[PDB]
Amino acid sequence: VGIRFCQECNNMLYPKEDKENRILLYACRNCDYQQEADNSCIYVNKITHEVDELTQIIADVSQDPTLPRTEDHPCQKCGHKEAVFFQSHSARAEDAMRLYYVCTAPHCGHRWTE
Amino acid sequence: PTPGNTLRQTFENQVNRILNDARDKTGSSAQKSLSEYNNFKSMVVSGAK
Amino acid sequence: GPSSQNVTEYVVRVPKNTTKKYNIMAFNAADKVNFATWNQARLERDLSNKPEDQPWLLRVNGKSGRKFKGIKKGGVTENTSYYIFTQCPDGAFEAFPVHNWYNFTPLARHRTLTAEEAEEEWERRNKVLNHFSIMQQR
Ligand SMILES: [Zn+2]
Ligand SMILES: [Zn+2]
């Protein structure tokens, strides 16, 4: 779910199992630096690929000129009855025609998808 | 979605079906509006061109 | 208090020339460098070319500590000028232009694979077995 790097030579960390204490042991095999990982996860792959695109969308896309501009469907944190709607248009990441609403206020940026 | 079809594919198929039905209906109305003396009708009922 | 409306007014001074040339470091924060380790330092020349237009070298604590190699920035300071403001008891800021900016990166201290024996594990282009124990043979 996440990776980190070595400390004193600053290299990439590889897994290792421990023969005695039976705990997974991430280690740099360019070194002898051994430590445990609290995540206890090494590999995950969402093959159907239902990632959350709410973190994917830049908060500054709303201030685009050539994007659409609706008047209904107001924002949540602020009222601001004006918003922009568009689609993801990302290849290989699903086929949904469902719309991605972003608030267009200069200091807002709470985006929602209904 | 239509079974066996992509959601974009079935959306495009529905839009194409609606616009083709519209063009068929408007062509039928235009053909019914033609007079007997209309030469455009005569050229295509004769089959010359 | 006084810090809620604190106003500080200091004097900027530029001397014309200094007998000792000044420059600037470049360390990444992701390197996680400490200054308590800085007990003995070396800064010498590279010998790979064999001097002013040649990349740099630095040593920490001899061979025990980590190693850096310095390279000069590619851009020219024809339209840029960088100043260093130093605090002094007289209270007047000093403005000193830097000469060059050098970039430094850490180096590993281990049995790196030499090039004359690097060709034997290229026949195992895809046939390579046990990536995790290549260092064990060395
Ligand atoms: Zn390491
Ligand atoms: Zn808002």
Automatic annotation (TrEMBL), chain B:
- Quote the subcellular location field of this record: Chromosome; Cytoplasm; Nucleus
What role is this protein assigned? DNA-dependent RNA polymerase catalyzes the transcription of DNA into RNA using the four ribonucleoside triphosphates as substrates.
The record's family statement is: Belongs to the RNA polymerase beta' chain family.
User: Per its record, how is this protein called by name?
Assistant: DNA-directed RNA polymerase subunit
